[PDB]
């Protein structure tokens, strides 16, 4: 009947989850470049920039 | 036109050539600053402002 009574593992499962989320989700990130996609930046570029 | 007046037209749904732009020695400079002379024949774009 009770439930929410193993809020241990279901804990861990959510820290690793939200761990992994924002690992993938930081990689759209611009970090000071002109975009964040390196096919667009390759074919619109002389190498040396 | 004058320089306070600079002229301004928008091009919109056309194929262009840049190269025959890019090769010919007429012009005295020629900077491009957002990308390279060369690639341009290969992007497309919409609503140009010259």
Redesign the interface.
């Known amino acids: 009947s009770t439930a929410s009574a193993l809020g241990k593992l279901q804990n861990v499962v959510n820290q690793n989850a939200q761990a992994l989320n924002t690992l993938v989700k930081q990689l759209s990130s611009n970090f000071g470049a002109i975009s964040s996609v390196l096919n667009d930046i390759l074919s619109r570029l002389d190498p040396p920039e | 036109a004058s320089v306070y007046a600079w002229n301004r037209k928008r091009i919109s749904n056309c194929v262009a050539d840049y190269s025959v732009l890019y090769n010919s020695a007429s012009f005295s400079t020629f900077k491009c600053y957002?990308?390279?002379p060369?690639?341009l024949n290969?992007?497309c774009f919409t609503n140009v402002y010259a």
């Open positions: 957002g990308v390279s060369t690639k290969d992007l």
